[PDB]
Write a protein that binds this DNA or RNA. Sequence first.
RNA 1: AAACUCCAUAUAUAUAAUUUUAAUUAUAUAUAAUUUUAUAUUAUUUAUUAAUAUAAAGAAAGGAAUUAAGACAAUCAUAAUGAUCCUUAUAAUAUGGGUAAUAGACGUGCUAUAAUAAAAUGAUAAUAAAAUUAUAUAAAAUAUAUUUAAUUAUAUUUAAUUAAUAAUAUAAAACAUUUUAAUUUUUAAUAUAUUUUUUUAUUAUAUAUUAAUAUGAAUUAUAAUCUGAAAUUCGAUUAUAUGAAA
Lengths: 105, 126, 402, 119, 55, 124, 98, 79
Amino acid sequence: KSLHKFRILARSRYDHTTDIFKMSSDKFEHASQNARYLHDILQRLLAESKDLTEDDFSDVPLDTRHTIAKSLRKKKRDYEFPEHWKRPEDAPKKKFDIVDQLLST
Amino acid sequence: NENLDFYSDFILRTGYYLGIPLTGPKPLPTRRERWTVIKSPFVHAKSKENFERHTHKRLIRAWDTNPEVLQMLIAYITKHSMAGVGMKCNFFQRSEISLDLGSTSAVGQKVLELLDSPDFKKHLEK
Amino acid sequence: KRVTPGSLYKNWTNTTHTAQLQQTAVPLALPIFNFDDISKTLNKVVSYSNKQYKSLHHLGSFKKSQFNELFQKPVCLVREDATNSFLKKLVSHPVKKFIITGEPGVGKTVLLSQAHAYAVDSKQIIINISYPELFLNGRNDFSYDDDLKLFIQPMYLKKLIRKILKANDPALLKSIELSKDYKFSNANPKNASVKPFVTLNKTKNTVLDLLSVMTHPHNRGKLMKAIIDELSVQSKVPIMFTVDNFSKVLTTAYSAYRNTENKQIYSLDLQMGKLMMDIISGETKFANGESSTILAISGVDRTNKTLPVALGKIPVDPYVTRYHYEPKFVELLQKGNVTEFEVPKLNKQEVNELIDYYKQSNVLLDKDITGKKWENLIDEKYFLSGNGNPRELLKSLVLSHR
Amino acid sequence: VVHILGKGFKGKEVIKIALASKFYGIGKTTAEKICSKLGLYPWMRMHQLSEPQIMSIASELSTMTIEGDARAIVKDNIALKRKIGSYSGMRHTLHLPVRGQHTRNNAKTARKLNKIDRR
Amino acid sequence: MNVPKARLLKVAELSAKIFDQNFNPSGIRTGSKILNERLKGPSVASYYGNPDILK
Amino acid sequence: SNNIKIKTLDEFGRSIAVGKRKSSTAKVFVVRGTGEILVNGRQLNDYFLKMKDRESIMYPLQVIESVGKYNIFATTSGGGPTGQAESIMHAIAKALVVFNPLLKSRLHKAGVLTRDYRHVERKK
Amino acid sequence: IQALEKSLDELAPLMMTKTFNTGVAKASVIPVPLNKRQRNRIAWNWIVQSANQRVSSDFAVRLGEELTAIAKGTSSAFEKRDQIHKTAIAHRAYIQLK
Amino acid sequence: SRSVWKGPNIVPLPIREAMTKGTPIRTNARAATILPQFVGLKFQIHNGKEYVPIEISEDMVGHKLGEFAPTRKRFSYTQ
RNA sequence: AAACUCCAUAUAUAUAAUUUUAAUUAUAUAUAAUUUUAUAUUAUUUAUUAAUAUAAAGAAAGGAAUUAAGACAAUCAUAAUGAUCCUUAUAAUAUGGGUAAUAGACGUGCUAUAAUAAAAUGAUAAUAAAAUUAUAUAAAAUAUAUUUAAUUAUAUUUAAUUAAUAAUAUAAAACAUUUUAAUUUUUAAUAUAUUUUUUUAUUAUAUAUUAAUAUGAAUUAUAAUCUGAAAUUCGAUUAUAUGAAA
Ligand SMILES: Nc1ncnc2c1ncn2[C@@H]1O[C@H](COP(=O)(O)OP(=O)(O)OP(=O)(O)O)[C@@H](O)[C@H]1O
Ligand SMILES: [K+]
Ligand SMILES: [K+]
Ligand SMILES: [K+]
Ligand SMILES: [K+]
Ligand SMILES: [K+]
Ligand SMILES: [K+]
Ligand SMILES: [K+]
Ligand SMILES: [K+]
Ligand SMILES: [Mg+2]
Ligand SMILES: [Mg+2]
Ligand SMILES: [Mg+2]
Ligand SMILES: [Mg+2]
Ligand SMILES: [Mg+2]
Ligand SMILES: [Mg+2]
Ligand SMILES: [Mg+2]
Ligand SMILES: [Mg+2]
Ligand SMILES: [Mg+2]
Ligand SMILES: [Mg+2]
Ligand SMILES: [Mg+2]
């Protein structure tokens, strides 16, 4: 239940296909400052997700519309060679070479 | 490309002795910038000279190395860098979810000052 | 005038459909379609019977863009994987609610015409909605009925009722005696000014009399509700309700009609839409257990998530906009337990049979008969048709002059 | 021929298109609302209309600002520009473009229609 | 789409709070864009080069 | 020494060849079969709407009269329908030579083994 | 297709007289032979012009009707061919033959 | 056309003196928007060369001062 | 000059732990052709030959840049040097205006004048390439125009990416269906059909008309929006209305 609430509250920052939650910040002038800022937000998001005393957002289904828009901008080569077309009996068969067989002994 | 490839080869040699597994240099797509300069005739004769600039790119990846050793690599190759080569380094640090001690804009300040000045307070009076 | 009595003035698609170009076709003697003796006609090209042709022309089973004008009368290949498989499920399945799917031009309409041919032979009353777009495009009159609380379409209903009367055997219709008394306003131009109303008493008049009632346009919606109710209460004759191009209904939730507030009218607020979905959903139950409901999609219509979700092929996505997902239609289809029958593509042996019939019909070009080996032709036409598509096969043979 | 408020229409003409074609001030969107309000189906033609329905169209058309009334509003807005002495008013008086168009070339239509008593 | 708007608004508000984002449900023009645009002065003022060159 | 190694069928009996036309590319898998073709996982009539494009793909198999003797799994990217269809045509011809190297001369004579060099030329 | 090729072979003129601006004096009208690709162009343009006089809105229908009439013997473009061949027979002596 | 939500194009002008004394307001702010207060006051509006005298009416509110001080002379040809 | 050289194309090797994925790719190096050979025919300077065709091998088919002189043109608002003239002005700054004026004429474009062609619709989303994003590119969502929704425009909010990663951006035509004035070639009411998305019959379905329509989108009214400190002279966009010439 808390995992579902976490994914709902992340909104566009969660990709269901890959299960990755990614957030970036360059608001501050130093990387250390920006790293803490992201860390603090992560703790806040986790605390809210693990506090299911008032609302768990279980009725609300996960929204993937942002991920769908991203997928339409990348070409998907999701087709593989049919397995029932494979003809393993037509593959070349290793020939017997006495020289290589004799050079190994 | 010539200095880029030579320097890339040197980085692989530096990493090996440091104990850093390295992959590459992977060639990335070359960027081409173009500019056309119309010449004095502009009569549709040989009246447009063309120019271009190619950015050659190489990616070297480091694996399974401690941060201290990785910094030694960057320091050494920086000390002995070649002319006309630029370098960007993305470091990836795996961390724990909860850490210890962690890892106001100029315009907003001036707005508050302006809204307190008499030229603005004289109107906000209710 | 520029147009003479016999001049071909329409566009190509309408000219081929309407110009009676089959008159010059050569008469061939083919076996007749009979499901009771399918063993003798399986995997063979057959013509329909004289009783079947008359009914199917009145039902709209044959459509334009089917190269029907190449042959004296429309013909069909009795297939084992499509025709025999579907008709056996229709006779055995207890629910008897099907939706025919498949890629564009695979032969979904022809399969429905073969199901109509079976029904004619098996003494059933067929109610066909060939082109549902005619009651959703806003090109005929509409009126609101207060007693039905639905928007009735008199012009369309007049045509539909005549099709149900002219396409079905009068004897079957006469057998169904009426269960209730009905009174309508008289529009018969002979006694309309003498008899204000026409009464149909129960147990005396039949559903044949009900289908011949001439009423005013405003009372024609109440005549369509009586006809359907009478056919759904009787248990003597099975009723086969069919709808071709049903994809148009699923993807056009809102008709072109607008109410008095300039708001487009929901399709289920039309009597035709409500009636169609009541039979599909199961709200209108037929007493006879051999009654069926065969729907067919068409590739000329847009596709969306409505039908795939209703058939269980994809999960429900709640955030899909209503223009690409109509949850009310999904509920109705799943309430009726509608099952999918995907029309398979033709195999190479079926292509051989069709091309052998085409050779005997003299429809093949001279480049495919002279100097070409028969086996080469079959292999080439099976490859150029997408490995079975009947429509791409015909086009490669008669509409590819390159 | 069907006559609505003097305008004559050929029988085959579609009502929603004909209304937006012969009546000043009524366009496509306005014509559709009139037909929807009167219960005329989207592609009904003029010859189908009955006399009660022809009177209903005239009634709804007479409760709108069309024909002279609409044309007077444009003529009075143009006159106001000239009365106040605005730059635009002078352009209307001089039969010149009033929307910033160049006049070194073209400007033929402005020289033909721009006037204080605009049609 | 079937998710009640009230439920989707509660998620938006809570999400905005966690991520320090401005929640403006009404849509009133607030000028927040002006407060977030980057300062281009330093780049613009260096167009002609560094003035502190040896002469 | 030379830089050419005899081409042979792979572990599954498939001949793999690549073809290019304009900006399009095609990688086809030819195996002995019954004339089944798939383009990017889709039926031929679905992917290629023009019958002339379909006839271009079939031409190499028609030259060796082996239209019903092979199954083709074609994958294509770039350019448009014509470039992809003819890139597949070129790739099938190059993949058919492994099954019978004696037919290369007939394929060359038909013109299906020649890479079409024409591409969009920036006006000069 | 066989009907189309037969109609094109019967309607197209075998030769056509062309004016050559040879010499400062008047140009010479000399009969010239036509190849098969040039013959088909002349006959096709005649067919298209005849087709576009028919009533159908669809060019395919008008073209189909025109081609059917030509395959059945009736065409007004056979007069054009006879007039191109008459001119050439008149100027037979103007040919050069070297 | 300035967006209505932004408000009028208000410029610094000496309106108090023109309302207590009746003096004309000489200005080059041709972009200025004629506010409803200006009604009745006398303005001298630059046109690039001279200052055109104009008194504001109620039908001029919303327009801009520049609209009433033409900057070009009517065209004429040496026919 | 040519050769050479580079680019393109074909091939080989190397690189990528094939999630920066396009391995059907990226970019370094190398190889290849200024193709080669047999045969018949026709010419020849007839021989160890060209033009031809025939057969065989081959992926092989296209481009780029390139010398020095001679005679002549341009102010270069695209760099100079001198002379010459201004030096409270011919130098410098600010506010506003102009460069956008309009009789005629000319060049170059855009959109049109309809049916081998225009308009709608097409969501498990037909099919590209080359570019751009720290003086940014802006996703999805929500709100309004505005209607169930979509579409289009803007606002609200500012996800990701400073990039083979994320965004601009689901390319478009194509193809399919529907519609389309002139056109009584239509539509409607009845009857009719073994053309049913349709046929036939009988009635009505206007005249006007060499002509401008449901073609065309100039001009113009009103309201709103975008950029900017500012859109009056003098910007862009949207909605309703207007609908010229052709
Ligand atoms: N069994 C068959 N025997 C003969 N011809 C057939 C058969 N099946 C299909 N055809 C032919 O294939 C073509 C397409 O058939 P049909 O119209 O039934 O396809 P469909 O899938 O319903 O098409 P759409 O997707 O356009 O609705 C027609 O020319 C039809 O005559
Ligand atoms: K109008
Ligand atoms: K101007
Ligand atoms: K001009
Ligand atoms: K890959
Ligand atoms: K200016
Ligand atoms: K057009
Ligand atoms: K694209
Ligand atoms: K302006
Ligand atoms: Mg961010
Ligand atoms: Mg989008
Ligand atoms: Mg991308
Ligand atoms: Mg069908
Ligand atoms: Mg200028
Ligand atoms: Mg796509
Ligand atoms: Mg968006
Ligand atoms: Mg698309
Ligand atoms: Mg389109
Ligand atoms: Mg005119
Ligand atoms: Mg228009």
